[PDB]
Amino acid sequence: NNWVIGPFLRPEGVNPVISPQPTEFYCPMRKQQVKWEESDTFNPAATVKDGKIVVLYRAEDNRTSRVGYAESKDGIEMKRLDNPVLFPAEDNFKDQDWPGGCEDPRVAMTEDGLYVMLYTAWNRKKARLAVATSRDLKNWTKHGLAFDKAYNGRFNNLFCKSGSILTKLKGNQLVIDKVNGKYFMYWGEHAIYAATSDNLIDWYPVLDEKNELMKIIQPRKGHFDSLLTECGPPAIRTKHGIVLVYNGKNSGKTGDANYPGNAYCAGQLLLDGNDPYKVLDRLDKPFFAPEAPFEKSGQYKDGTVFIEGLVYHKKKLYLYYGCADSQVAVAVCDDVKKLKT
Numbered sequence: 001n002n003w004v005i006g007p008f009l010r011p012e013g014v015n016p017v018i019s020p021q022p023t024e025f026y027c028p029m030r031k032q033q034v035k036w037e038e039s040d041t042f043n044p045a046a047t048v049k050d051g052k053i054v055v056l057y058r059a060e061d062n063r064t065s066r067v068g069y070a071e072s073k074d075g076i077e078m079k080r081l082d083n084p085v086l087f088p089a090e091d092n093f094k095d096q097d098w099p100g101g102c103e104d105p106r107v108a109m110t111e112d113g114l115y116v117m118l119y120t121a122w123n124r125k126k127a128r129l130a131v132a133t134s135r136d137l138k139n140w141t142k143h144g145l146a147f148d149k150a151y152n153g154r155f156n157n158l159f160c161k162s163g164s165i166l167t168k169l170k171g172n173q174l175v176i177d178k179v180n181g182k183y184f185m186y187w188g189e190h191a192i193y194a195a196t197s198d199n200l201i202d203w204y205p206v207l208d209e210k211n212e213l214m215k216i217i218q219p220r221k222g223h224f225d226s227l228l229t230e231c232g233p234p235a236i237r238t239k240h241g242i243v244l245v246y247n248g249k250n251s252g253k254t255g256d257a258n259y260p261g262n263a264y265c266a267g268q269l270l271l272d273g274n275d276p277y278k279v280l281d282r283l284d285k286p287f288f289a290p291e292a293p294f295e296k297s298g299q300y301k302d303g304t305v306f307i308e309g310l311v312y313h314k315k316k317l318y319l320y321y322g323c324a325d326s327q328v329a330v331a332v333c334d335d336v337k338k339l340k341t
């Protein structure tokens with residue numbers, strides 16, 4: 001396991017870094033003041049801008065999901081905005097995100113400074129992968145569903161979520177990186193799939209010889225990833241190939257007894273740097289699992305963690321995750337040599 005990214009250690013006493021608050025904003029959908037982050041602040045994307053770490057967290061009201069913004073000098077202290085930055089609005093995407101909102105963002109940045117967010121649009125009928133862009137991280141422009149166009153709209157009503165764009169470390173920053181002249185992402189919840197794109201907006205799911213969605217990995221009985229194998233933060237190139245950090249949901253009946261039933265633990269998949277569909281290695285045991293009190297609650301007695309943000313900052317990697325389906329926590333890795341390529 002020389003290729004594994006880590007270890008990620010929880011800084012003592014700092015977690016959780018983002019918790020719910022009764023903060024209000026005027027909702028253009030509900031046309032009234034809404035306590036948009038009163039219930040939970042979790043499943044966070046993370047990125048960097050102007051030397052600062054930015055965490056874009058899923059927030060739920062009393063539900064509708066909206067994305068909040070938090071800014072941090074050191075990756076620990078958070079300065080939050082009173083208004084959410086991505087939410088259902090009076091726009092041309094009501095069919096996609098009214099009334100369930102915008103969930104579970106993952107963010108990556110192009111070398112030219114465009115931040116691309118892959119998130120889930122929820123209309124209470126289908127949860128569907130959507131794309132938003134921004135240059136300042138506060139003003140987001142929706143571009144619709146990731147699979148709206150591809151193959152005569154074949155997957156325009158496919159239930160799907162969790163998009164992890166391929167990135168690499170370039171001169172002090174994680175940037176989006178291409179594969180064979182096209183942009184690339186892993187995606188999925190019940191299996192890990194892939195998709196390509198010319199423009200980061202319209203994505204084309206990779207199909208196999210049977211003209212079916214090609215699964216790279218899927219759940220395994222007896223292991224932590226026994227019910228789901230869900231994309232975590234953006235994938236990252238390393239000396240040994242492409243590493244995808246992913247979240248496994250454990251079955252209490254057919255999973256790994258060493259971990260809690262129905263909880264998520266994090267694994268890693270090593271794929272070939274020349275052939276991103278080719279698996280080279282996969283962790284048998286999770287590299288990050290619920291262990292601390294802040295990752296547990298009444299609903300998740302033994303805890304649960306969901307990894308969704310990964311940033312390189314001052315020669316360290318900061319991992320941001322949803323803890324107990326309700327708060328945001330951070331863990332840090334100071335071993336980054338493997339990222340130089």
Ligand SMILES: [Cl-]
Nearest residue numbers: 008009010011
């Ligand atoms: Cl730890």
Ligand SMILES: [Cl-]
Nearest residue numbers: 216217218219
């Ligand atoms: Cl598999």
